């Protein structure tokens, strides 16, 4: 009866592909709104229109485990790979999995330290997806089916 | 016998003078519940059978002749009690009170954020353990947590012999807080900071970390109060509140129940007489803030107290939102004159900026409407913002920067610069703030898109004088100078780049050009292709000669070049070359789709450009009938190219947040699609509580 | 600057007029929702209308002190009196007094023998503005001006 | 080896059998925080130095041959541990325990409404201390607090004789809480109960109060745990949190912070993975409920626990509404789509009924839509509810009636019959509950109008067979006989009287005549005026000859009689005499107003009449031209008779929501209203979002 989407997130470096940490996702937000100039301040003309709208994506994880070699070896770019499984309404337990990944994700946490008192463990690592002049947004959708 | 009353009240209250501030509600613990101290200074007869010392005390306060006959020592004690009660805010009996007034007088330098004065005071010498305690809290707010921990340990070592229970208690709690925060911060460094900062920040070396880890192992704070002498616990039952590990325990539950009552009032539309729920929770908020800042408790920097103030201030702000348009009924407004509306003063600004996280402020904006309330003490807010901006400029300019202070500070500075949208600032202060924002805010914690949108927010109450456009010019020229390197690219978290800086300048200054960009362009070569591509965005910021040279050196045979050219108005129509190029790009993406069907459907990255092409087809921009051949991807493609054929059950409501008013007007005028969008909007608003959908419906009342 | 409506309420028996208890008003909900039959089940015809909307005026008081005579003596109707210093936006200072009273009331306290463990005093007493078929609601307002 | 781990875990869980259920989250303190027992039962590792603490036990559970290798005593111990872990709902290891079924737990019978069964068990001879402890909880739930106190003291004596610590602890806390119940009950009795009925009840003689004060005094439960053997402290550390008067210390702040997280998720629009915040709140709720019921602790009939469960269930229902109305993105749909709806089963129904107040149920319906969420376990709800109705019927049937039971249980019965609108109920059970509601409900707590509207709510979904119509008719007959005494006046807290019961009967059943009312009509005479008034109110429910008798006995004389006449269909169109009366009443109001202009003006009763006259004037019901002589006395009147001159600053939100369909249609028909009303409406909805205002805006005006 519970949600069968206990996704697993793999955080790997973008330059070469080295794994940084594995974790189980906790929350993920898609933000979709305009603040370009003012509420209506886009540049254009009578015959011109540009969809300058910008989308900011944020993620976070739980059960974060770092790799021994990555901690031992210590413009960087990183990627996150989701791993879930499809479950259509028409067909349950779809063997075909579902892969999501962001090739360019920034590990810039909105939280900084989260100074707590209690002995509660919840190391949530908040990321955010970046962009480039070549590609507007980086994430990718794909299914085994 | 007035002498007996003065002796009793002095014996009860004089030892509390050592504390810089005493909570109003917690006073009831001093007398063993003989009375009930309401938050607004009114004081209500508690179940008791006493002489009624408080009524007589206020009688002496009202009548000069009555107090004129007191003895010298009793008169001095009465004067001390008078100034104590005035300082706290206890006024008079509940019955005698007919009209009272509130106040906001948090008197902590650490609260105010005047880091230069904090550093100056730290540099100054010390003469009393209170001064050292102040300096410890100041250093901890300034991030020097090793120095703050050492000074707190020194404070403890002095207080154990000075025989001051309050200072020993408060320093013990705060040293435990600094240990907890330093441990959590170093854990965050070791784990994430490698990945986030891109480097292994170790402000605290391993030996000192091990030292603090070993120094007070098995230190249970819940036994701290019990471990103190009999006199302290008997007379400082007020201070049982902090000693628990979970400080803010009872007060959190009381805030929860007051929140419940306030929400019940909002749902019912009930009218509150006397002291409303909002007034009491506000006074408790301010009492806690004053208590912990004036007494210099480091616990204010923790997530427990940050969440507490976040919940309290949010509650006040949402209640004020309701009260701005609350039910009239013709009776509520008739009972009292005008309205005690909520206005955001300097202390509220400091509270919201410091104690919120940025996402919390975005939550407040989404739920409440902060632009519609009135702001006051603009001079104080300007001083606060100038302190913040000059602090970040002074620190980040220098290679030296306490990284732990950066972690403890960047949240505050981020929130202050984010929440200064609603404040008016002087041209001097505005210029300095924007200079700091554009230059010395670090790249790690603030990216280009966030930088631009925060500047754009900062330019709300005040337009752009020449100084601001000059500083933006300087920043953009610096970025152009740094963009020579072949291994450097612009990454935006929000999705806004320096082209938006240029658009901002050109919108706020129609006739504007830059000689620095013109002269850096005049010395360009075909070898440095990336710089050419970057400067392609800042075309209107160039001179005519530079424009001609830039046009000669490169064409627009590309999709990103096409988007940049149309955006800054280079091309008013799509030439055969441009439509051919986009057709080719869509062909290669389509064959990629055909290949990927077996591997899985993928449409997220280029969907921006598919949506753009679809809207262009809708807007009579692309006049080629080949566009129909590539229907089949549902990423706002069928939405625009073939609205009739699009499957509306795949519609997402969030696709109406991004469209501009021109495109909203155009899509509002179509008879083949309007019904689905309007019914989706109406059921969305009926089932949701977002104001943007109200705005769309206003634009789509049709 | 505070809400200048600090008040005193006087509870009296309606048949005779003996003072029952005195307190200070805390809040006063004024609700008006249609609850006859279903959401839309009122009886009417083409030319027939009757406002069947029914007001319920719940009030509350705090710090209740009862009378020694009332405690010693021990279809019972009861009344309420409420008094407050009035105020105007132009001139908060106001000699005139606002008189509120509820001749027909029930002491239908929502306390229901509440049992908060803490030793906190709260003699909260909730009213219910009763009425009769002759008079829809019994309250009165008159300013002294 | 496996024997070692089995011996250790059995030594650690040996005394934990005695509690009939223990919270999963509370198991952490048994293991000294070695593991982290999640609410779902998954055991996530948190701290371990050794090996095989719980992974070995999970392996033994998985492998049958490994269990085979164990010895006979170890085999029995493993079987016992297996039983314990399947009853507690605790999985053996998170590492392997991923997705799992979430099903509501089980509880004891005192949770259920089997009051007759509780009496049956009480009458039987007790077997052991546990039987009598359950019996004491049954009596206290049955409101025999004298007997509950006596028997709790008895079993405390038995426990100290036998040295069974658990029952000693539970009975001592239950007896302290029943002592609090007795104390606060006598207090509230002496205070208000005399004022609510007419005579004060004395269920407890003053000797009994003196005895319970004297036997134990200066007894604070905070030291109860401290005053126990170290064996109890070590083994039953799980019971430490029960010994505090500030009960629900932790669960309250945890609920607050998880509500804050849920609200942040709501405002942000974020999507959660794994177990959400609402799921863990629900399992914490069930854990604590089962812990306090299966163990039979008296702390469940108290305000702290009632508000805790109130806020819990309220939060769960707001989250259910949110997920129901949450917008789904294509990316989110690909990640997850078509989520199962919120489950609202029998246990949640009893939770709401027992632990809600009427005003909080109102608040929940105002905030969340509980009609939309489906209801499960209909038969169990039917059985519990019908048991409640039977218990109240038999309580108020016998002359003997426990006042304490009435007070402590009437809230639960009131809320259950209130909240039973949504559930479907069997016809026999419907007969039982309506018989209970009408005939055997009091007037101290439930008034007449509240009772009517609750009957209507129960009529909302599960419709009424003819047994119910007969019950309502007989109730009206009982009220008729009651009105013989010329001393009792009809009242209503909600402005709803017996005429409303008759209206419900006539609306559900098209044609219906009461024989008993027709009989009682023929015997009354002129002297009994108020009985004639009551039968005039209930006029549409008796035979034609009785109607003729009532018509001959009196007619319309005053304004109230006229309004009642239109309220039960007697008069279809106002006549010249009726309007002559209406202008006469308006003259009386005018001269009253001019005389009282020295003092203020009052319109709460007269506002209904004046407003309704204004409405009648709006729809052209009254053609009299003298109607426009009474302008400028009542805001509603001026609005509806002369809208042009009515300045639109006295407009009232109550009107803006208190409308009629044809009223709103007529308002929209007139532009003079339309401009100002739509202006205030859009201002209201944009400034503050309300369901009714938005519905009115989008249904009639546009």
Q: Which residues of A touch D42 (CB under 8 A)?
A: none
Q: Do chains C and D touch (3 or more CB pairs under 8 A)?
A: yes
Closest Cα to residue D475, out of D500, D438, D443, D501?
D438
Angle between helices B559-567 and B576-599 (to 10 degrees): 130
Give the Cα-Cα-Cα angle B517, B519, B521 (nearest 5 degrees).
65
Q: Which two tokens stand for residue A106?
A: 């920034």
Q: How far is CA B655 from the centre of its chain?
A: 28
Q: Return the residue matching tokens 């419940």.
A: B260
Q: How near does any CA of chain D get to the CA of C96, in Å?
A: 10
Inspect the interface and report whether the beta carbons of A27 and D272 lie closer than 8 Å.
Answer: yes
Any idea what DSSP says for residue B527?
T
Instruction: Please report all neighbours of B, defined by 3+ CB atom pairs within 8 A.
Output: A, C, D
Inspect the interface and report whether the beta carbons of C38 and D460 lie closer than 8 Å.
Answer: yes
Q: Return the residue matching tokens 């005690």.
A: B340
Q: Do chains C and A touch (3 or more CB pairs under 8 A)?
A: no
Inspect the interface and report whether the beta carbons of B329 and D255 lie closer than 8 Å.
Answer: no
Nearest to C87 among B45, B276, B336 (CB): B336
* CA gap A122, B581 in Å, rounded: 50
3-state secondary structure (DSSP) of residue B444: coil
Start-to-end Cα distance in chain D: 77
Give the Cα-Cα-Cα angle D229, D231, D235 (nearest 5 degrees).
130
Q: Which of D94, D100, D274 is the best mutation test for A, with the most CBs of A within 10 A?
A: D274
Q: How near does any CA of chain A get to the CA of B109, in Å?
A: 22
Inspect the interface and report whether the beta carbons of B652 and D255 lie closer than 8 Å.
Answer: no
* CA gap D238, D231 in Å, rounded: 13
Q: A61 forms bridges with which residues in the sheet? A: A25
Q: Which two tokens stand for residue D288?
A: 């604590």
* CA gap C141, D442 in Å, rounded: 32
Q: Which of B300, B495, B693 is the best mutation test for A, with the most CBs of A within 10 A?
A: B495
User: Among residues 255-294 of chain B, which lie with CB inside 8 Å of chain D?
Assistant: 255-257, 260, 263-264, 267-269
Closest chain B residue to D372, measured at CA = B687
Q: Return the residue matching tokens 């100054």.
A: B124
Nearest to D270 among A4, A29, A89 (CB): A29
Q: Return the residue matching tokens 């209506």.
A: A40
Start-to-end Cα distance in chain B: 79
Q: Which two tokens stand for residue B456?
A: 């754009």
Q: Which residues of A touch B224 (CB under 8 A)?
A: none
The answer to whether residue D339 neighbours chain B at the CB level (below 8 Å) is no
3-state SS string for D334-385: HHCCCCCCCCCCHHHHHHHHHHCCHHHHHHHHHHCCCCCCCCCCHHHHHHHH
Closest chain B residue to D337, measured at CA = B650
Closest Cα to residue D495, out of C33, A7, C114?
C33
Nearest to C6 among B36, B274, B337 (CB): B274
- CB of A83 within 8 A of CB of A33? no
A33-40: list long-range contacts, CB under 8 Å, 24+ apart.
A33/B657, A33/B658, A33/B692, A34/B657, A34/B658, A34/B660, A35/B453, A35/B456, A35/B457, A35/B494, A36/B496, A36/B500, A36/B503, A37/B456, A37/B500, A37/B503, A37/B504, A37/B507, A38/B456, A40/B660, A40/B661
Enumerate the H helices of B206-273 as residue ranges: 206-215, 230-235, 240-243, 250-268
C44: phi then psi, degrees, rounded to nearest 5: -170, 175
Q: Which two tokens stand for residue B43?
A: 């004081």
3-state secondary structure (DSSP) of residue B44: strand
Spatial neighbors of D702 by CB under 8 A, at least 6 apart, are B701
The answer to whether residue D266 neighbours chain C at the CB level (below 8 Å) is no
Give the Cα-Cα-Cα angle B457, B460, B463 (nearest 5 degrees).
120
3-state secondary structure (DSSP) of residue D49: coil
Cα separation values, A2 from D38, D86, D324, D346, Å: 15, 19, 16, 19
Inspect the interface and report whether the beta carbons of B198 and A76 lie closer than 8 Å.
Answer: yes
Closest Cα to residue D189, out of D139, D145, D142?
D145
> Within 10 Å of residue D552's Cβ, how many Cβ atoms?
8
* CA gap B53, B8 in Å, rounded: 9
On the 0-12 / 13-18 / 19+ scale of CB atoms within 10 A, D101 is exposed
- CB of A145 within 8 A of CB of A86? yes
Q: Which of B273, B276, B319 is the best mutation test for C, with the most CBs of C within 10 A?
A: B273
Q: Which residues of D touch C115 (CB under 8 A)?
A: 177, 180-181, 184, 301-303
**DSSP string over chain C:** -------EEEEEESSS--EEEEEEEEEEEEEE---SSSTT-----SS-------EEEEEEEEEEEE-HHHHHH----EEEEEEEE---SS-S----EEEEEEEEEB---TTSS---SS------EE-B---BTTBS---EEEE--
Closest Cα to residue B300, out of B284, B289, B314?
B289
D420: phi then psi, degrees, rounded to nearest 5: -75, 10
Any idea what DSSP says for residue D195?
H
Q: Is the dihedral of CA B311, B313, B314, B315 positive or negative?
A: positive
* CA gap B356, B303 in Å, rounded: 10
- Element at A31 (helix H, strand E): strand A19-33
- CB of B282 within 8 A of CB of B230? no
Nearest to C6 among B33, B98, B271 (CB): B98
Q: C142 forms bridges with which residues in the sheet? A: C99
Q: Which residues of D touch C132 (CB under 8 A)?
A: 489-491
Nearest to D330 among B322, B652, B688 (CB): B652
Q: How far is CA D605 from the centre of its chain?
A: 31
Nearest to B329 among D324, D652, D702 (CB): D652
Nearest to C3 among B33, B95, B275 (CB): B275
* CA gap B392, B398 in Å, rounded: 10
The answer to whether residue B33 neighbours chain D at the CB level (below 8 Å) is no
- Element at D110 (helix H, strand E): none
**How do the residues of chain D divide into helix, strand and coil, expressed in percent and rounded to 5?**
65, 0, 35
The answer to whether residue B340 neighbours chain D at the CB level (below 8 Å) is no
Spatial neighbors of C46 by CB under 8 A, at least 6 apart, are none
Q: How near does any CA of chain D get to the CA of B652, in Å?
A: 6
Inspect the interface and report whether the beta carbons of D360 and B686 lie closer than 8 Å.
Answer: no
Q: Which two tokens stand for residue A104?
A: 């360019």
Closest Cα to residue B252, out of D319, C119, A114, D254?
D254
Nearest to B363 among D268, D307, D684 (CB): D268
Antiparallel, parallel or unpaired: β A78-85 and A8-13: antiparallel
Q: Which two tokens stand for residue C42?
A: 């009122």
- Element at D270 (helix H, strand E): none
Q: Which two tokens stand for residue D416?
A: 């259950």
The answer to whether residue B369 neighbours chain D at the CB level (below 8 Å) is yes
Q: Which two tokens stand for residue D238?
A: 């799980």
Closest Cα to residue B452, out of B423, B426, B490?
B490
Instruction: Please report all neighbours of A, defined by 3+ CB atom pairs within 8 A.
Output: B, D
Give the Cα-Cα-Cα angle A124, A128, A131 (nearest 5 degrees).
165
User: Among residues 592-621 of chain D, which lie with CB inside 8 Å of chain B?
Assistant: none
Inspect the interface and report whether the beta carbons of B271 and C87 lie closer than 8 Å.
Answer: no
Inspect the interface and report whether the beta carbons of C141 and B331 lie closer than 8 Å.
Answer: yes
């Amino acid at each position: 009866t519970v949600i069968q989407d206990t996704a697993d997130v793999y955080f790997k470096r973008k330059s070469d592909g080295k794994l940084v940490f594995t974790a189980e996702a906790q929350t993920a937000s898609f933000s979709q709104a305009i603040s370009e100039e003012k509420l209506r301040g886009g540049i254009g003309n009578k015959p011109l229109y540009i969809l300058k709208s910008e989308k900011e994506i944020n993620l976070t994880v739980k059960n974060a485990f770092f790799d021994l070699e990555w901690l031992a070896m210590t413009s960087e770019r990183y990627e996150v790979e989701y791993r879930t499984i499809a479950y259509n309404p028409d067909t349950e337990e779809v063997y075909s999995d579902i892969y999501i990944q962001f090739p360019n994700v920034s590990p810039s946490g909105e939280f900084e330290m989260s100074l707590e008192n209690g002995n509660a463990l919840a190391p949530e690592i908040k990321f955010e997806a970046l962009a480039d002049t070549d590609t507007d947004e980086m994430a990718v959708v794909i299914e085994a089916s | 016998k007035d002498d007996e009353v003065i002796d009793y009240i002095y014996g009860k209250i004089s030892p509390l003078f050592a504390l810089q501030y005493i909570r109003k509600i917690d006073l009831k613990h001093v007398f063993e519940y003989d009375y009930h101290f309401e938050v607004n200074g009114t004081v209500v007869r508690h179940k008791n059978k006493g002489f009624g010392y408080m009524e007589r005390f206020f009688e002496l306060k009202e009548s000069c002749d009555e107090r004129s006959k007191l003895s010298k020592k009793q008169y001095e004690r009465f004067n001390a009690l008078f100034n104590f009660f005035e300082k706290n805010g206890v006024i008079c009996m509940a019955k005698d009170a007919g009209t009272l007034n509130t106040s906001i007088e948090i008197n902590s330098l650490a609260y105010h954020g005047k880091y230069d004065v904090m550093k100056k005071f730290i540099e100054e010498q010390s003469v009393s353990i209170e001064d050292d305690y102040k300096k410890a809290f100041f250093l901890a707010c300034l991030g020097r947590w090793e120095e703050s921990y050492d000074l707190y340990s020194n404070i403890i070592l002095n207080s154990i012999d000075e025989s001051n229970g309050c200072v020993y208690y408060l320093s013990q709690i705060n040293r435990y807080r600094i240990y907890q925060s330093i441990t959590q911060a170093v854990t965050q460094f070791n784990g994430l900071g490698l990945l986030t900062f891109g480097r292994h920040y170790k402000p605290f070396t391993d030996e000192f970390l091990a030292r603090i880890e070993r120094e007070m192992t098995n230190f249970n704070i819940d036994d701290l109060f019990n471990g103190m002498p009999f006199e302290f616990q008997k007379k400082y039952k007020i201070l049982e509140f902090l000693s628990d590990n979970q400080f803010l325990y009872d007060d959190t539950v009381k805030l929860f129940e007051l929140t419940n009552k306030v929400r019940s009032e909002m749902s019912e539309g009930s009218y509150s007489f006397g002291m409303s729920s909002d007034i009491v929770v506000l006074l408790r908020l301010y009492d806690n803030l004053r208590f912990l800042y004036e007494n210099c408790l480091w616990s204010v920097s923790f997530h427990e107290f940050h969440q507490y103030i976040r919940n309290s201030m949010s509650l006040l702000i949402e209640k004020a939102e309701y009260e701005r348009t609350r039910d009239i009924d013709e009776l509520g407004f008739s009972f009292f004159g005008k309205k005690s509306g909520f206005f955001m003063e300097y202390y509220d600004f400091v509270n919201i900026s410091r104690h919120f996280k940025i996402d919390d402020i975005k939550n407040l904006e989404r739920s409440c409407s902060i632009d519609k309330i009135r702001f006051g003490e603009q001079e104080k807010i300007e001083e606060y913002l100038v302190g913040i901006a000059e602090e970040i400029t002074k620190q980040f300019s220098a290679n030296g920067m306490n990284v732990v202070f950066y972690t403890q500070f960047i949240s505050e500075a981020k929130a202050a610069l984010y929440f200064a949208k609603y404040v008016k600032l002087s041209e001097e202060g505005l210029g300095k703030i924007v200079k700091a924002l554009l230059f010395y805010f670090p790249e790690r914690d603030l990216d280009i898109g966030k930088r631009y949108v925060w500047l754009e927010r900062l330019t709300k109450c005040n337009e752009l004088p020449k100084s601001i456009i000059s500083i933006i010019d300087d920043f953009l020229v610096l970025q152009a100078e740094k963009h020579i390197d072949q291994n450097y690219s612009e990454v935006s978290s929000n999705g806004l780049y320096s082209r938006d800086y240029g658009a901002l300048i050109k919108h706020f200054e129609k006739n504007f050009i830059s000689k620095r960009l013109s002269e850096i362009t005049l010395c360009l070569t075909q070898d440095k292709q990336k710089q050419i591509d970057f400067l392609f965005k800042l075309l209107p910021l160039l001179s005519t000669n530079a424009k001609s040279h830039l046009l000669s050196f490169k064409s627009v045979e590309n999709i990103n070049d096409l988007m940049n050219g149309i955006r800054i108005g280079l091309i008013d129509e799509f030439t055969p070359e441009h439509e051919e190029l986009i057709i080719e790009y869509l062909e290669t993406r389509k064959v990629n789709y055909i290949v990927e069907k077996e591997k899985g459907i993928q449409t997220f990255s280029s969907n921006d450009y598919m949506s753009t092409f679809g809207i262009w087809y809708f807007l009579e921009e692309i006049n080629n009938s080949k566009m129909e051949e590539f229907i089949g991807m549902d990423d706002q493609y069928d939405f625009f190219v073939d609205p009739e054929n699009f499957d509306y059950k795949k519609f997402i409501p969030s696709w109406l947040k991004n469209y501009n008013d021109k495109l909203l007007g155009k899509i509002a005028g179509n008879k083949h699609m309007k019904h689905h969008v309007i019914e989706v909007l109406k059921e969305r608003v009926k089932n949701s509580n977002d104001k943007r959908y109200l705005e769309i419906l206003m634009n789509y009342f049709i």
